[PDB]
Structures are given as C-alpha cells and as structure tokens.
Amino acid sequence: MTEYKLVVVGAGGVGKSALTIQLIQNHFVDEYDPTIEDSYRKQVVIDGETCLLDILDTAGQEEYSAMRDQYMRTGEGFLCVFAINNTKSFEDIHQYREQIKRVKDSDDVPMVLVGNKCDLAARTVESRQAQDLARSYGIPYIETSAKTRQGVEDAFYTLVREIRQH
Numbered sequence: 413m414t415e416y417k418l419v420v421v422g423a424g425g426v427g428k429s430a431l432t433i434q435l436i437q438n439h440f441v442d443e444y445d446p447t448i449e450d451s452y453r454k455q456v457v458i459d460g461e462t463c464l465l466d467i468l469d470t471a472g473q474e475e476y477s478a479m480r481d482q483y484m485r486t487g488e489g490f491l492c493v494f495a496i497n498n499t500k501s502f503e504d505i506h507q508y509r510e511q512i513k514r515v516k517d518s519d520d521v522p523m524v525l526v527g528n529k530c531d532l533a534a535r536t537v538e539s540r541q542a543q544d545l546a547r548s549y550g551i552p553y554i555e556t557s558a559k560t561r562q563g564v565e566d567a568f569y570t571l572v573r574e575i576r577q578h
C-alpha cells in the first residue's frame with residue numbers, strides 16, 4: 413500500500429538515530445554510536461491511511477558520510493534535524509537543505525525543520541529563530557525530545573503530511 417520514503421539528515425550527534433528509534437521501537441537510545449547509513453520500515457496508520465514508512469537514517473559525521481548523497485536520492489521527504497543546544501547544528505541546516513536540493517534536482521522538496529533535545533535547558537537556539545528559518549523555507553518547525561517522546565510522532569507524521577502536499 414501507500415509507501416512514504418523519509419530521510420533524516422543533520423549534523424553529527426543531534427539525535428537523528430534516537431528520534432527514529434523512539435518512533436519505530438519506542439525506547440530512548442542513551443549512548444552515542446555514530447551512524448553510517450541505516451534503514452527502518454514500519455506499517456502505521458496516519459490520518460486514516462494505512463501506510464508503510466521507509467526511513468533512512470543518515471550519517472552526520474563527515475568521516476562516515478561516504479555515498480550519503482546516493483542513498484538520499486530516493487527520498488520523498490526530509491527531516492532536517494538540529495539540536496536546540498547546538499548552535500552550529502542549526503547553522504549547518506542551510507547546507508543540508510542545499511544538499512537535498514542538489515540530490516533531488518528541485519527547489520521544491522517536502523521537508524520539516526526539527527529542533528531536537530527539547531528536554532534540555534542549555535538552549536542556544538530559541539524557538540523564534542528556528543520558526544523564522546522554517547518560514548523562509550516554506551516549511552513547518554517542530555521541536556522534539558527523543559528522550560521523553562515529546563513531538564516525535566508529530567515530527568514524522570508532519571513530514572508525511574508535507575509529502576502529501578507535493
């Protein structure tokens with residue numbers, strides 16, 4: 413049935429894997445193991461539609477990013493993740509978005525901006541700053557915590573809702 417190909421991108425350590433694993437497997441990964449390229453598939457009902465999520469969890473560490481752009485080519489929508497306690501990861505978002513536009517050869521690609529680790533109080537990216545970035549892109553901004561589950565389903569389901577607008 414309806415399949416949605418989602419790709420999760422962003423700087424090393426922002427919580428791409430923890431977010432995906434919380435969504436799919438319902439637990440929090442406390443440790444840090446850098447990703448090369450992993451995929452997950454699960455059947456879910458989203459707004460009354462039974463569908464299949466195929467999620468590519470990509471490397472954020474440059475050293476482990478070989479051929480990432482090839483893996484990403486098939487993505488239908490992209491979760492652009494930064495951490496709210498990592499200003500550099502937020503600044504990097506523009507470069508991830510440019511890479512997405514390159515691999516899709518389009519300036520109109522479904523995406524959602526995600527500010528993760530919202531359970532932490534060492535915030536250096538304020539909500540309004542991320543809202544403004546997302547506005548400039550024509551996409552939603554959503555905050556998440558892979559640790560508490562806050563916003564996790566919402567982030568991924570919102571991306572499906574963006575793909576459906578394409």
Ligand SMILES: Nc1nc2c(ncn2[C@@H]2O[C@H](COP(=O)(O)OP(=O)(O)NP(=O)(O)O)[C@@H](O)[C@H]2O)c(=O)[nH]1
Pocket residue numbers: 422423424425426427428429430431441442443444445446447448470471472473528529530531532556557558559560
């Ligand atoms: N407090 C808190 N810690 C988080 C959250 N998400 C991830 N972390 C922590 O941050 C570290 C990195 O998470 P991870 O998911 O591996 O990040 P990543 O973006 O997949 N890294 P990589 O690009 O190298 O694969 C882990 O120690 C993890 O527990 C969150 O929402 N809250």
Ligand SMILES: [Ca+2]
Pocket residue numbers: 439440441442
């Ligand atoms: Ca755990």
Ligand SMILES: [Ca+2]
Pocket residue numbers: 513514515516517
């Ligand atoms: Ca291209």
Ligand SMILES: [Mg+2]
Pocket residue numbers: 428429430445446447469470471472
């Ligand atoms: Mg990872």
Ligand SMILES: [Mg+2]
Pocket residue numbers: 536
């Ligand atoms: Mg500031």
